[PDB]
Design a protein around this nucleic acid. Structure first.
Lengths: 234, 132, 147, 128, 51
RNA sequence: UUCAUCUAGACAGCCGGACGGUGGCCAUGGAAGUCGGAAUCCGCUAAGGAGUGUGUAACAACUCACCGGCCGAAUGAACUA
């Protein structure tokens, strides 16, 4: 539902991890306490895969994927590739993508149905995003920012977007995405809301410095929220 | 507050004017000091890719000018060794300004971003378009 | 089963007192414990000290007032420092009252028990002017009658 | 108003509901109980004066059902407890006091610090 | 939670000591002179401050 | 050098008891001899304070004033060079 935890001592989670519907990816250099937040609440439903991308620990920003597919940058070594295809199930498709815009997660924001991409992405790529993910591809920028990945978190239920956005611009995105949209802040007021948190249908993990008024707004638009052991025995 | 980084070659002494990559109004940065530097007689403290340096803005909006504020180096023109083997170098020097926590005032970064700068600072890795 | 006793001090209207600290190791009681106190301190003032001891086993109530202490002399009156220093016509009433106190006094008859009970009341006016020290130094009433 | 629920941060468990809360709301504000007094070894020597904080940083709740395995097993005069799934220091029990940060006293307290737990409404969404 | 039977056991070695004013040494409580030679075996002793 | 205790039992330690009205009473989250202000009483007495202290959340536990035995010849203070 709405859990809060932190990697080594940093609040942001979507930089260091990638949460999807069918799988989840985590960075390698973490405590047991960071992994226990994912292991307890997911359980044996989806595989939690330890990996690295292009010799880094920031695999949330480098990769981009959904239920059906996973895209990795060109700089991904072949040893890191085969470790992914083994642990992830047979259904997901894994493809290396030749980009000038290397970091795919900042460029691409997507879910089961609708993708938003950075507008300077080229035409031969836009076929490969639709072919792998099975998703219609739309070019748009959140009000001031070309980077749709870091400044717009999205899921099947809804979407949390950049705070400095006009209502008429939020209307035009809502028509295109066909989901309701809420502006908010995460991690005591950081505008970086796509990398500040991760989300899917069952779970939404945020930083520890997210205050409770911010976490209440997050759980509302995602509609994740819903007791006998509490009782009065004096 | 600086995380562990493997040593790369020191290529920006005190007095360097590097470009300003983000879109917070500024056009260049005048480096005055480098956080975490050592001490030796007659040695200028130098910057590298990934270091957090103190810098003033010489050219830009007048709100930004005339105040010292720390900054993160995102490109380096001096070549350096990566452990996998290659020697690589960018075309120019570059930096982004930041608050002393390490959060970034800039909304986005133009041009390429050094890979070692991305892992060391998370907020740079959020705003970065291209990482090498 | 088990037999345990604890003691409760003061309180007029309602007070957790000793029991809350002592009720921790025992069965936890908040509503009934002050109610068991409220059964005992009924028709007793709140300003006055009231000494009790309650023996419970599986949430039992025991209401008693032992009154070996100054509770007896405090019982007869009508209510920086609210002074107790009053005059009372103790002599006939206190002789019945000290016999209520002297269940063991561990002395001889009521005469030795009258020289200690009046000394416990170091505040009240007693019989006529003074009922303390040189005035209650000799007692020529009751005496052998209560024996 | 509506009922409120207290969920644990990083455990996501409803620790205590409403129909609780012995909140004790007004402070004393006079010199001996609104002020924190730090005495010395002898002769009631006052060395430090600390003014009380604004809001009481705790939640004073009744003894509940999920504290019963901790309260009965190794009963003592003071201690602490946790969320039942993450084992972090969430609140402590004290039969003494520990007034509030803002200060009165209470009765025996089950003090539940407002840091590292938060308060939610149990009712439907606000729909902003 | 300290169970003050044990605190009185603990206070003998830590708290119930005397302190020399000059050399700040931790001396036995009923001692008259300091055992250290650098302060000249002085008799100017104070109690250790209680918490 | 000058004083004072001492086989009429010293100093040191040991060995007994330290009880009854006692959680007295105002004092306030709680103070029971010990955070304290004013009061200072009786009983059992060989003798024992509404209490010299350590300590206790509040008690306790210990210790002391005091009461009687044993151990048995030296002990204490202020100085001067």
């Amino acid at each position: 539902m709405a859990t809060r935890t932190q990697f080594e001592n940093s609040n942001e989670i979507g930089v260091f991890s990638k949460l999807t519907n069918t799988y989840c990816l985590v960075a390698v250099g973490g405590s047991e306490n960071f992994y226990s937040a994912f292991e307890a609440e997911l359980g044996d439903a989806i595989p939690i895969v330890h990996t690295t991308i292009a010799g880094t620990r920031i695999i949330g920003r480098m990769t981009a994927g959904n239920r059906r597919g996973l895209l990795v940058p060109t700089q991904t070594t072949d040893q890191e590739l085969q470790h992914l295809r083994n642990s992830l199930p047979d259904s997901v498709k894994i493809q290396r993508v030749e980009e000038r815009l290397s970091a795919l997660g900042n460029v691409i924001c997507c879910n089961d149905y609708v993708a938003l991409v950075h507008p300077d992405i080229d035409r031969e790529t836009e076929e490969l995003i639709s072919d792998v993910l099975g998703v219609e591809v739309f070019r748009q920028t959140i009000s001031g920012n070309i980077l749709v990945g870091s400044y717009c978190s999205l899921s099947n239920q809804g979407g949390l977007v950049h705070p400095q956005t006009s209502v008429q611009d939020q209307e035009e995105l809502s028509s295109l995405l066909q989901v309701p949209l809420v502006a908010g802040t995460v991690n005591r007021g950081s505008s970086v809301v796509g990398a500040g948190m991760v989300v899917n249908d069952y779970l939404a993990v945020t930083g520890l410095d997210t205050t409770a008024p911010e976490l209440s707004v997050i759980e509302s638009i995602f509609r994740l929220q819903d007791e006998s052991i509490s009782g009065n025995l004096r | 507050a600086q995380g562990t980084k493997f040593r790369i070659s020191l290529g920006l002494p005190v007095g360097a004017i590097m470009n300003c990559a983000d879109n917070s109004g500024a056009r260049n940065l005048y480096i005055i000091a480098v956080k975490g530097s050592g001490s030796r007689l007659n040695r200028l403290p130098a910057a590298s890719l990934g270091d957090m340096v103190m810098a003033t803005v010489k050219k830009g909006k007048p709100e930004l000018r005339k105040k010292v504020m720390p900054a993160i180096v995102v490109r380096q023109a001096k070549s350096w060794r990566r452990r996998d083997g290659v020697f690589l170098y960018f075309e120019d020097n570059a930096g982004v300004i930041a608050n002393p926590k390490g959060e970034m005032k800039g909304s986005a970064i133009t041009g390429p971003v050094g890979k070692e700068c991305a892992d060391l600072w998370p907020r740079v890795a959020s705003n970065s378009g291209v990482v090498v | 089963x088990x037999x345990x006793x604890x003691x409760x001090x003061x309180x007029x209207x309602x007070x957790x007192x000793x029991x809350x600290x002592x009720x921790x190791x025992x069965x936890x009681x908040x509503x009934x414990x002050x109610x068991x106190x409220x059964x005992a301190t009924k028709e007793f003032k709140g300003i006055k000290v009231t000494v009790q001891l309650k023996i419970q086993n599986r949430q039992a109530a025991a209401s008693v007032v032992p009154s070996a202490s100054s509770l007896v002399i405090t019982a007869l009156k009508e209510p920086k420092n609210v002074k107790h220093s009053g005059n009372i016509q103790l002599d006939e009433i206190i002789x019945x009252x000290x016999x209520x106190x002297x269940x063991x006094x561990x002395x001889x008859x009521x005469x030795x028990x009258x020289x200690x009970x009046x000394x416990x009341x170091x505040x009240x006016x007693x019989x006529x002017x003074x009922x303390x020290x040189x005035x209650x130094x000799x007692x020529x009433x009751x005496x052998x009658x209560x024996x | 108003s509506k009922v409120t629920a207290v969920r644990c941060k990083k455990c996501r468990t409803k620790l205590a509901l409403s129909t609780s809360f012995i909140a004790h709301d007004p402070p004393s504000k006079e010199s001996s109980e609104g002020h924190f007094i730090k005495r010395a070894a002898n002769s009631h020597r006052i060395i430090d004066i600390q003014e009380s904080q604004a809001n009481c940083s705790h939640f004073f709740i009744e003894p509940l059902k999920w504290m019963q395995p901790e309260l009965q097993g190794k009963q003592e005069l003071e201690g602490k407890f946790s969320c039942p799934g993450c084992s972090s220091k969430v609140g402590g029990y004290n039969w003494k006091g520990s007034r509030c940060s803002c200060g009165k006293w209470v009765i025996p307290a089950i003090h539940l610090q407002t840091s590292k737990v938060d308060q939610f409404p149990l009712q439907s969404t606000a729909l902003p | 939670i300290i169970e003050p039977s044990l605190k009185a056991l603990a206070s003998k070695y830590n708290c119930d000591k005397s302190v020399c004013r000059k050399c700040y040494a931790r001396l036995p409580p009923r001692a008259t002179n300091c055992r250290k030679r650098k302060c000249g075996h002085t008799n100017q002793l104070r109690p250790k401050k209680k918490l």
